[PDB]
Structures are given as C-alpha cells and as structure tokens.
Design an enzyme around this catalytic site. Structure first.
Site, PDB file in Angstrom:
ATOM      1  N   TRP A   1       0.139  -1.286  47.745  1.00 61.05           N
ATOM      2  CA  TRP A   1       1.195  -0.279  47.988  1.00 61.05           C
ATOM      3  C   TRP A   1       1.176   0.125  49.483  1.00 61.05           C
ATOM      4  CZ3 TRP A   1       1.506   5.026  49.497  1.00 61.05           C
ATOM      5  CH2 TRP A   1       2.795   5.574  49.381  1.00 61.05           C
TER       6      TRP A   1
ATOM      7  N   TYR B   1       8.049   8.448  35.781  1.00 64.36           N
ATOM      8  CA  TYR B   1       7.164   8.168  36.934  1.00 64.36           C
ATOM      9  C   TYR B   1       6.583   9.353  37.657  1.00 64.36           C
ATOM     10  CZ  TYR B   1       6.072   5.390  40.925  1.00 64.36           C
ATOM     11  OH  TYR B   1       5.432   4.730  41.939  1.00 64.36           O
ATOM     12  N   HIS B   2       5.240   9.249  37.964  1.00 64.73           N
ATOM     13  CA  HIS B   2       4.505  10.274  38.625  1.00 64.73           C
ATOM     14  C   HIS B   2       4.077  11.444  37.707  1.00 64.73           C
ATOM     15  CE1 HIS B   2       5.680   9.161  43.009  1.00 64.73           C
ATOM     16  NE2 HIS B   2       4.766   8.394  42.445  1.00 64.73           N
TER      17      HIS B   2
ATOM     18  N   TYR C   1      -2.450   2.416  45.628  1.00 71.00           N
ATOM     19  CA  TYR C   1      -2.128   2.063  44.263  1.00 71.00           C
ATOM     20  C   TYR C   1      -3.139   1.148  43.598  1.00 71.00           C
ATOM     21  CZ  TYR C   1       2.653   4.007  44.150  1.00 71.00           C
ATOM     22  OH  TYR C   1       3.716   4.846  44.281  1.00 71.00           O
TER      23      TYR C   1
ATOM     24  N   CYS D   1      -0.883   8.443  46.119  1.00 70.59           N
ATOM     25  CA  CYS D   1      -1.024   6.998  45.737  1.00 70.59           C
ATOM     26  C   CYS D   1      -2.454   6.421  45.883  1.00 70.59           C
ATOM     27  CB  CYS D   1      -0.102   6.074  46.493  1.00 70.59           C
ATOM     28  SG  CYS D   1       1.510   5.994  45.668  1.00 70.59           S
TER      29      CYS D   1
ATOM     30  N   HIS E   1      -0.295   7.883  38.367  1.00 73.76           N
ATOM     31  CA  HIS E   1       0.414   6.621  38.148  1.00 73.76           C
ATOM     32  C   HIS E   1       0.027   5.763  36.976  1.00 73.76           C
ATOM     33  CE1 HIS E   1       1.345   7.631  42.278  1.00 73.76           C
ATOM     34  NE2 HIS E   1       2.123   6.653  42.250  1.00 73.76           N
TER      35      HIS E   1
HETATM   36 CU   LIG Z   1       4.056   6.449  43.296  1.00 72.72          CU
END
Ligand SMILES: [Cu+2]
Ligand code: NA
Length: 639
Positions: free
Chosen positions: A290, A495-496, A272, A228, A581
């Site tokens: 985040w 996601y990811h 993030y 992240c 991300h």
């Molecule tokens: Cu994440």
C-alpha cells in the site's frame, strides 16, 4: 462530512426547553432554519453557569427516532462548541432512561451527528456535559431529529445493538489497552482523513467502558502517521504499530505506562501488511505494498528484547500473493497470519494458496496446500476474515471477502481449517452452508463461548461507499456447525470499520469511511450485546463472578487457581485483540479444562506450547451452566 441514517423531522409543532438562554440567543434559535442564529446559554451579565447544559424537545407526537444533528455556531466563534454529550429519549418527559448515544464531538464548526438504533419517542434531550475547550457555555445554531421509515422491535434471543458511542474521529484502527480495559482508536494525521498527510502525527482517542469517557491525544513522539499499518501485541504486551502513512516506522504503545515509544524502523517500508506475534514473543510481518513502494516485500522479524527488525529474505512473499487485478499494490495485503508452533507463522489466505512461514536463519516458506472443500477450491478472498476460535485444536474459521480488493462481489464461502504441526497440510472443510450474506470489509471476533460474531461489510466492495450494506450480523456455532442471524443494526459498517471483543464480553463495532469530504465518515461505534448476557425474560442475566485468582501472570504450562461465586461449567482464555482493515492477528481462544477443587474453587493449566498460548495478555472468562459469562480477568501469559 457525515450523515444521519434517517429523514429530518418537521419542526413545526415542536416545543423546546433550555436550561438557560441569553436574550437574542433563545432556545428556539436552534430550531429556526437559520444557521446564523443560535441558542446560547447565559453569559456575561447573566453570569456564566457551567455545563451540563440541556436541550429538550417535545415533538408533541411519537416518532421512530434514529438520530440527531447538531450544527454549531457558524460565526467564527468557538464558544459553546459541545465536547462530551449524551442523548436521551422519552415517551413521557420524565422518564429518560439510559442515553441512547454519548461520547465526544470534535472541536470544529462542522455539523455533528448522533446515529442510534430506532426507538419510538415523543421527547428528545441532548445534554452538553462539556464544552469543546472547557468553557461554561453551550451554543447550537440548529438542531434536527431524524426518523426511520418504520420501527421493528428487535427479536428476542438475538442480541441487542446500542448504545452508540459518538467519537471525535473515524476509528479505522483500534486496540484494547489490556491494563486499562480502554478501547484505543486512531485515524491518521486528521480526524477524518488520511490523504495528504505530512506524516509524523496521529490522532488517537480512547473510550473507557467503565466511565463512558472518550479521551483524545495527538501522538507525535514516534513521528508516525499510523494509518494503514501492521498491528501486533508482542510477547511483552506492547502493541507494535508498523508502517502505513510513515512506511518504515514502528511505534510502540505501552498500556502500563499509557505511553507511545518510538520503535526501530523496519528494514522494508510497507503499508497494509499484516504482522503476527510468534511463539517466542517476536513479531513477523510480510508484504504491504500500500505504501513504501510496490515490489516484493519478503518477511522481517522484530525482536522486543533487542529492539531490532531483521530481514528474512527467504520467507518469500511470492506464494501468498492473490491474483488481484490491481496487481501487487493490493495482492500482498492483509494476509491471514497466525503465530503457531515453533516460531512458525501460518498464512491461511486471502490467496487460495495457504503457506507455512518459518523464522529460523534467513527464513523459509513451505506450501500448506489450497483452501478448498468438497465444493471446490476456494477463490482468493481479499478482506475475508479469519478467526482462530480453538487454538488448542488449531481451528480457524475463514469467511467472506472477494477476489479483488474492490469492484468485485463478496462471497458467502466459509471454511474451517485445522492446523497440525508446522510443515503439514492442514485439513480444510466448508463451514455449514456458508454465510447467510456475502460480505467484504466485514469484521469479526471470537466470543467467550467459542462462537464467532460477524458483522458489517457490503456485498460488492466499493471503498468509501455505503452501498449494498449488510445490517444483519451472523454468529457461527462450531458445536452445531450452524450460522445464526442476529438482530440487525442501522449503521453501515464497510471499509475502514473495526470490531473488538470488550473485557465485559460485549462487542465494540465502529468506524468506516475516513474520506475527508465524503459523507460516509462514521464518527462512532455501537455496542452489540450477545444473547448470552440476557435471561429468557429479555433482562440481563446474573453473571458468575471471579472472586479470586492465584496469580495474574503465568508461564505457558502454568496453573491458575480461581474461586467463583457460583459453580462454573466452562472457562476460556481469549487473547486481547487489535484491529484494522479487516485484520486481527492478536485475538484467539483457548478452551480450558477445569479441575473442580470443590467449593467453587477451580484450577486449570495454560497450554504448555507458546505457539498455542501465544505470550501477551489474555482475558479469562468463566461461564455458568446457563452459559452466561463473567467479565474477564486479565492474565499475562509469558514464555
Ligand atoms: Cu485503508
Ligand atoms: Na438557528
């Protein structure tokens, strides 16, 4: 856990072959249905023959194969765990071709998978190239093959997906190492999870496109769990990784020395956030709630020369926050940042409000207006993507995303923003009729020809859930202001997930998941080969070659001379990418104007503005009249 993309094929009629099998460890124990029994190559008294070891299956009939599972021995012993492997398919048993999947499996006793595009085959072969711990044996408890519901041949002229690269980790963050051409990937303190980290450690894995080798390394020297983070390639070509699981740390990856160096701690702990390289080589970051706490996180700037982080409290995060329902925890994340002229940073979104960030004195922020078009003001587009496809003309294409980070429907909205001088309100228009498919968590890259490749995502953002997947990638062609669907793939990329442009002009797409026990971890990547690499017949086109480069290091405003093997029509410089991300603040393209020196000799000047030609490493591509690009040449651009 992981999962296969197809349904298990009945193992009734099958006939299997092994290179060796110790009595009690027959080839066939691998297809008995008993996880307690396994195939094992010769050992002890039969000798210990080294890998490659091979498992060949004759399904007797033709199946639309899309995957294989390999359950290792479950008896507590590690001997024979497969590291490096290759999967091959055959209609006949003699002609195997190129592997449909290859890579490395992590050294554990969990079921491992190979997911790949559907291909009719009667025969399957798995080659164990290495043993997880470098021993000679190969053991398999159980082996399964999966089939698709049906098979539909890729359409001609729409690119092709494959092969699959199997990895030991979920690549949720990746970078291209510019000096080596390898794709550097990382996950977290574990190969498949981030939750519960003691921090201080990150599992990385590198894939070398030239050798097909997947290498893994645990990084502890920077005392940073790099999941992240903010990622930028600074003015020196070092990749700057900030925060995330160890919210204040900075780790520096030097491609040259293939090493990780501790950087200075940021002033504010974040996770993030996006970071963006500046016209002077410095790295600017803002936001990131985040991790490190949830409060207003203003700008700070990293100087690679003094190795310090300096706070810019007046470059305020407030004007760029989205209206996310979860609040500030998500609203300051993954800003669409771009280093621009004169130390400026443009923030194109995801908030409807666009802003100019300035880095002199203690910073500043000025409104650049709203992302909008004749169709209306655009709503917040958290996890939408933004690509600077013509840095010379300040053109940025934005698309996809949703008003909230999760539990919100994605949009088809797409816009073109044209930047001018910092401080001025850029012009924004709608891009064609928008995407063919609404998507969020999708990824994208700018290609050598100025088109933008967009892939993966889901229509409703539900992290760790492979629902409403979009399997049809799209390409935006700016000259035409038109989007084009490409051939679809079979692996969900939500996601990811990540996408990077490879120096060979192909796209590496992988990842997704990282939720420990979930079954939505994807320990692989696929390669997408754009149609500009094929000729009419569906075969690979012949590519121009760059025979000479006058220099591999140039100052902004500098000239480069090249010789090619064929006449070239176009050339572009593509800055090396970093991705996590949905964010990639490092890629960008500069279209070059070529001077024909006669004799397949050409020169071009790199733009004199370092806010256009951001310092760091770039890829030089030349294109023939046919549109086929060369493999890149790497040029370092300095101020
Ligand atoms: Cu994440
Ligand atoms: Na078995």
């Amino acid at each position: 856990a992981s999962a296969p993309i197809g349904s298990a094929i009945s193992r009734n009629n099958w006939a299997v072959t092994c290179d060796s099998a110790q009595s009690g460890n027959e080839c066939n124990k691998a297809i008995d249905g008993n996880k307690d029994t396994f195939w094992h190559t010769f050992y002890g008294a039969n000798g210990d023959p080294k890998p490659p070891h091979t498992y060949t299956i004759d399904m007797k009939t033709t199946q639309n194969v899309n995957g294989l599972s390999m359950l290792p021995r479950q008896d507590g012993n590690q001997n024979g765990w497969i590291g490096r492997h290759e999967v091959y398919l055959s209609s006949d048993g003699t002609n195997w071709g190129s592997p449909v999947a290859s890579g490395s499996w992590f050294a554990d006793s969990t079921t491992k998978y190979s997911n790949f595009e559907t291909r009719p085959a009667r025969y399957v072969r798995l080659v164990a190239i290495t043993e997880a711990n470098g021993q000679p044996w190969t053991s398999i408890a159980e082996i399964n093959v999966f089939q698709a519901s049906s098979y539909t041949a890729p359409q001609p002229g729409l690119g092709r997906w494959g092969p699959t690269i199997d990895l030991p980790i979920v690549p949720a963050a990746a970078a291209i190492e510019p000096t080596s051409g390898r794709v550097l990937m990382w996950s977290s303190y574990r190969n498949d999870a981030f939750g519960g980290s003691p921090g201080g450690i990150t599992l990385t894995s590198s894939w070398d496109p030239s050798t097909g080798i997947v290498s893994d390394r645990t990084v502890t020297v920077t005392k940073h769990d790099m999941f992240c983070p903010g990622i930028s390639m600074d003015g020196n070509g070092q990749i700057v990784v900030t925060g995330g699981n160890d919210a204040k740390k900075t780790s520096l990856y030097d491609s040259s020395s293939d090493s990780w160096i501790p950087g200075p701690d940021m002033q504010v702990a974040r996770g993030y956030q996006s970071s963006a390289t500046m016209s002077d080589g410095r790295v600017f970051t803002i936001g990131g709630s985040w991790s490190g706490g949830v409060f207003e996180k203003n700008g700070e700037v990293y100087s690679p020369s003094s190795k310090t982080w300096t706070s810019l409290p007046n470059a305020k995060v407030n004007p760029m926050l989205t209206a996310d329902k979860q609040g500030l925890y998500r609203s300051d994340n993954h800003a669409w940042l771009f280093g621009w002229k004169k130390g400026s940073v443009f923030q194109a979104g995801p908030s409807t409000a666009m802003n100019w960030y300035y880095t002199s004195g203690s910073g500043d922020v000025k409104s650049a207006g709203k992302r909008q078009s004749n169709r209306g003001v655009a709503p917040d587009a958290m996890c939408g993507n933004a690509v600077m496809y013509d840095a010379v003309k300040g053109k940025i294409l934005t698309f996809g995303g949703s008003p909230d980070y999760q539990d919100s429907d994605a949009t088809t909205n797409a816009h073109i923003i044209t930047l001018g001088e910092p401080g001025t309100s850029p012009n924004t228009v709608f891009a064609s009729n928008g995407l063919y498919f609404a998507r969020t968590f999708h990824t994208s890259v700018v290609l050598p020809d100025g088109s933008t490749f967009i892939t993966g995502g889901q229509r409703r953002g539900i992290p760790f859930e492979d629902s409403t997947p979009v399997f049809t990638p799209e390409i935006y062609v700016p000259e035409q202001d038109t989007f084009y669907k490409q051939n679809p793939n079979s692996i969900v990329r939500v996601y990811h997930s990540i996408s990077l442009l490879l120096p060979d002009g192909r796209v590496f797409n992988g990842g997704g998941g990282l939720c420990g026990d979930c079954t939505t971890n994807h320990f692989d990547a696929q390669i997408f080969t754009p149609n500009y690499l094929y000729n009419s017949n569906g075969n690979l086109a012949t590519r121009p070659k760059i025979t000479r480069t006058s220099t591999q290091s140039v100052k902004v405003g500098g000239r480069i001379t090249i010789s090619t093997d064929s006449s070239i029509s176009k050339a572009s410089l593509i800055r090396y990418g970093t991705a996590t991300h949905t964010v990639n603040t490092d890629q960008r393209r500069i279209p070059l104007t070529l001077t024909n020196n006669g004799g397949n000799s050409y020169s071009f000047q790199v733009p004199s503005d370092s806010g256009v030609a951001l310092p760091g490493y770039w890829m030089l591509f030349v294109m023939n009249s046919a549109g086929v690009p060369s493999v890149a040449s790497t040029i370092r651009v300095t101020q």
